[PDB]
């Protein structure tokens, strides 16, 4: 329930010690946690915000060029002189143009030319940034209560959201029933600002890093304009024409918009036409949930004469959905709910809506389960009207092992060392774990850093050649340790 | 599928991508066919006319 | 003297009229009144419902 | 019960309206005006002119 | 604790423009959807409805696509509706209707519910 | 593009009474987005149906509704005095827009 219907879910089972699980949740999917006497939550990142930006330093786009004016002067005679040059709002660049008696003159050589144009700006592309606090993101928390028209209705009074502040980041939510959840998260280690520029056209938004955003050549000037007419490197958008050595002349080079889209491939769009709404990123952020009881124990088992209103229809990675009609008497009650198979009678298939309840007793109760990997069967009522309805699942054998480990390596990938952290503490492995990806990931950093799609295939390749053609055993790690990873990175960027 | 007044039940796959001009299942006022060329012939016998 | 053209290319354009289409899973494609006419560009694409 | 239709072959059609328009060499290729629905079947080819 | 009141208008001109307008209270603006139905008398409630969000990205009507247009503010809360080129068949009663807005600000897909609360209904006439 | 539920039904206090209402496949065939509507002579049309067996609370039991493709039904099991006024369907085409019904006057006496 606002899990449901997503294609990212990232089931995480279990807690460890202290009743505190550890996960790592982005805009992308949303997850599910199980524990084992406890209600299952759904926890879903909504909204990044940066609330104070300082813009940092601004491009120009399309520009103007008036006020041409141009000196010459004899061959023999030094250097023409303006005191537009000198002016930073003119852009100037020397030459020689042929001189004689024709161009009156006299010494027939060839003598320089100075040529002025008034900088003229009217596009701008305001490269805003903001600091580590003030960032305040918004995770939504729902639990699995079966609840008429809420699987995945992103919206309404299906759950409580909190906001988290990486100087306040506790702040614990008192859902409605269940108990009350803790979290601890970790915001200043995630996406990690003052290394981001909130880049700003004229209403697109992009989020690229400093040392790109300082290093495209493209005329500038600092955050504070206040008359500006000062932009900095003013050449890379003019261009000087001297045709045949004789005169030469200053054209502007035009709207820099389009290729400075093609600048952006590779830049995940943000919006700031109200506020500075990022949706990219995550979090680490560690799930302590203490005080959370179930909403339903100490209930009585059903009557019986269930009905279902809507069919069992199963989401993506298998987990069926079923919405139930009670009626009856004894109206706060717990629904006798089962997966099971026929006679030789045994028990397979696990519960994810944990103790679901009916209340208010006109109003149906959608429940979710968890089907084995062949066939199998779902009950409901006990002594009459035995609800039970038939079920079949596609192979989710080993396609699901599988499937959860290209899951796992995938999350892996896209996420850096923080992947370790979606784990209830596996203790001295995870946190070696981590160590040996952080190590491993700064030696793969500073390098492949600028390298495409196609380039770290083909250093992939090339690498793994070496890794085959080796000797004294060093062919395993240069294959597997560099080599195909450098491959399944090489198919897996850009996303 | 159901042609003229017979019905047969066939392939998924195999009908997907049979050769002819299809048209989407959701579409009102059918005469955005699409693989029309199967359908069609361009006859330019010689270098003249088409 | 006299030129013929051979071949006009776009520069800046714009995209009014935005349209969109969307149907439930495993029930073939989208269909759309503007996919007709050519002025309007088109792609197909997978939303999760 | 209730069947939802996904595709819809055509068998048997017929084709009006036929229209060409031919252009000088080098010089491009034509345009017409039709060719902007997507009912109008078409196709580009070389005559010697 | 949702109400939902407007603002009527006693009677118009063909030819002129009518700017009927309404008041959301109980609940906030920027994540709410906020359509418009007709009521003819004794007719089909047509549909007006214009999917406004916290940002003003709002898509037109298909039978009268290229004939209104409206306006809205979040600071007073109001959406409003300019029904330009008035006619002799545009008297109904119209009603502006609540709708619920996704939580990633952009309307994409409307809710499972549509018109949980509604507004009291604006009786224009034309003359 | 219109829905297609006819003019007027009846029955007596006591009864079941099934309001019928036939669309498109593309906001009925293929989608569950059916809600219904009470308007009330001397009302706002209040929301009586969600999704289409769902139902707003306030709403009483007394409302069923189903779809069977193409077509979506109301039942009303047991009817009372309290019913007499128009019922609007609706639907979410897969274009954009929504459309309404024409409208069902009901009587018990």
């Known amino acids: 329930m606002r899990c449901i219907g997503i294609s990212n879910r990232d089931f995480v089972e279990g807690v460890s010690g202290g009743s505190w699980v550890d996960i790592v949740l982005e805009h992308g999917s949303c997850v599910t946690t199980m524990a084992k006497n406890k209600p299952t939550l759904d926890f879903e990142l909504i909204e990044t915000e940066a609330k104070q930006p300082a813009t940092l330093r601004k491009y120009c786009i399309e520009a103007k060029l008036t006020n041409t004016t141009t000196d010459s002067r004899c061959p023999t005679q030094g250097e023409p002189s303006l005191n537009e040059e000198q002016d930073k709002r003119f852009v100037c660049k020397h030459s020689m143009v042929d001189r004689g008696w024709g161009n009156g003159c006299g010494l027939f050589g060839k003598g320089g030319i100075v040529t002025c144009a008034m900088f003229t700006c009217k596009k701008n592309m305001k490269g805003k940034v903001v600091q580590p606090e003030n960032l305040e993101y918004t995770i939504v928390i729902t639990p699995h209560s079966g609840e008429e028209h809420a699987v995945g209705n992103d919206t309404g009074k299906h759950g409580k959201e909190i906001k988290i502040t990486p100087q306040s980041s506790i702040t614990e939510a008192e859902l409605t029933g269940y108990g009350t959840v803790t979290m601890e998260c970790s915001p200043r280690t995630g996406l990690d600002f003052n290394e981001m520029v909130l880049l700003q056209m004229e209403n697109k938004a992009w989020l690229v890093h400093r040392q790109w955003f300082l290093d495209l050549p493209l005329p500038w000037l600092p955050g504070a304009d206040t008359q500006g007419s000062n932009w900095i490197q003013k050449e890379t958008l003019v261009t000087f024409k001297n045709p045949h050595a004789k005169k030469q002349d200053v054209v502007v080079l035009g709207s820099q918009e389009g290729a400075m889209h093609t600048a952006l491939t590779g830049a995940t769009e943000i919006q700031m036409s109200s506020g500075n709404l990022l949706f990219t990123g995550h979090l680490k952020c560690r799930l302590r949930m203490d005080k959370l009881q179930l909403k339903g124990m100490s209930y009585s088992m059903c009557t019986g004469k269930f009905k279902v209103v809507k069919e069992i229809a199963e989401t993506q990675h298998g987990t069926i959905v079923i919405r139930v009609q009670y009626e009856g008497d004894g109206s706060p009650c717990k629904i006798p709910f089962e997966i099971m198979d026929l006679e030789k009678r045994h028990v397979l298939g696990r519960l994810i809506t944990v103790n679901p309840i009916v209340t208010e007793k006109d109003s149906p109760v959608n429940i979710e389960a968890e089907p084995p990997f062949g066939d199998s069967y779902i009950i409901i009522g006990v002594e009459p009207g035995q609800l039970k309805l038939n079920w079949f699942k596609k192979g989710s054998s080993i396609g699901q092992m599988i499937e959860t480990t290209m899951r796992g390596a995938k999350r892996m990938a896209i996420l850096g060392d923080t992947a370790w952290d979606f784990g209830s503490l596996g203790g001295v492995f995870t946190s070696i774990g981590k160590a040996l990806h952080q190590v491993f990931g700064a030696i793969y950093g500073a390098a492949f850093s600028g390298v495409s799609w196609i380039m770290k295939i083909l250093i992939g390749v090339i690498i793994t050649w070496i890794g085959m053609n080796s000797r004294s055993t060093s062919l395993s790690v240069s294959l597997v340790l560099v080599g195909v990873v450098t491959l399944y990175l090489g198919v897996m960027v850009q996303a | 599928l159901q042609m003229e007044n017979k019905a047969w039940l066939v392939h998924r796959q195999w009908f997907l991508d049979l050769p002819l001009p299809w048209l989407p299942g959701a579409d009102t006022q059918g005469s955005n066919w699409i693989q029309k060329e199967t359908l069609v012939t361009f006859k330019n016998p010689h270098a003249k006319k088409q | 003297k006299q030129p013929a053209t051979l071949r006009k290319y776009c520069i800046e354009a714009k995209l009014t009229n935005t349209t969109t289409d969307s149907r439930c899973p495993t029930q073939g494609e989208p269909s759309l009144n503007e996919e007709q006419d050519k002025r309007f560009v088109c792609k197909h694409s997978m939303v999760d419902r | 019960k209730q069947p939802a239709t996904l595709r819809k072959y055509c068998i048997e059609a017929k084709l009006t309206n036929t229209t060409t328009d031919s252009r000088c060499p080098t010089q491009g290729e034509p345009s017409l005006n039709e060719e902007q629905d997507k009912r109008f079947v078409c196709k580009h080819s070389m005559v010697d002119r | 604790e949702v109400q939902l009141v407007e603002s009527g208008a006693e009677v118009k001109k063909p030819g002129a423009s009518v700017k009927v307008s309404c008041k959301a209270s109980?609940?906030?603006?920027?994540?709410?959807?906020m359509h418009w139905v007709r009521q003819a008398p004794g007719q089909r409630l047509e549909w007006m409805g214009w999917?406004?969000?916290?940002?003003?990205?709002?898509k037109y009507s298909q039978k009268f696509q290229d004939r209104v247009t409206i306006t809205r503010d979040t600071s007073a809360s109001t959406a409003y509706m300019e029904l330009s080129s008035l006619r002799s068949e545009d008297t109904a009663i119209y009603y502006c209707?609540?709708?619920?807005?996704?939580?990633?600000?952009?309307?994409?897909?409307?809710?499972?519910?549509?018109?949980?609360?509604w507004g009291q209904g604006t009786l224009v006439t034309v003359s | 593009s219109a829905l297609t539920q006819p003019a007027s039904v009846s029955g007596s206090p006591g009864q079941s009474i099934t309001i019928s209402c036939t669309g498109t496949?593309?906001?009925?065939?293929?989608?569950?987005?059916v809600s219904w509507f009470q308007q009330h002579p001397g009302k706002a049309p209040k929301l009586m149906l969600y999704?289409?067996?769902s139902r707003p609370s306030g709403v009483s039991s007394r409302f069923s509704g189903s779809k069977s493709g193409n077509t979506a039904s109301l039942t009303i099991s047991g009817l009372q005095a309290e019913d007499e006024a128009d019922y609007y369907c609706?639907?979410?085409?897969?274009?954009?827009?929504?459309?309404f019904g024409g409208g069902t006057k009901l009587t018990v006496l």
């Open positions: 209707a609540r709708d619920k807005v996704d939580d990633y600000g952009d309307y994409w897909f409307p809710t499972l519910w549509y018109f949980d609360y």
């Open positions: 109980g609940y906030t603006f920027t994540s709410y959807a």
């Open positions: 999917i406004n969000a916290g940002n003003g990205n709002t």
């Open positions: 496949s593309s906001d009925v065939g293929g989608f569950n987005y």
């Open positions: 999704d289409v067996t």
């Open positions: 609706s639907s979410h085409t897969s274009r954009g827009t929504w459309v």
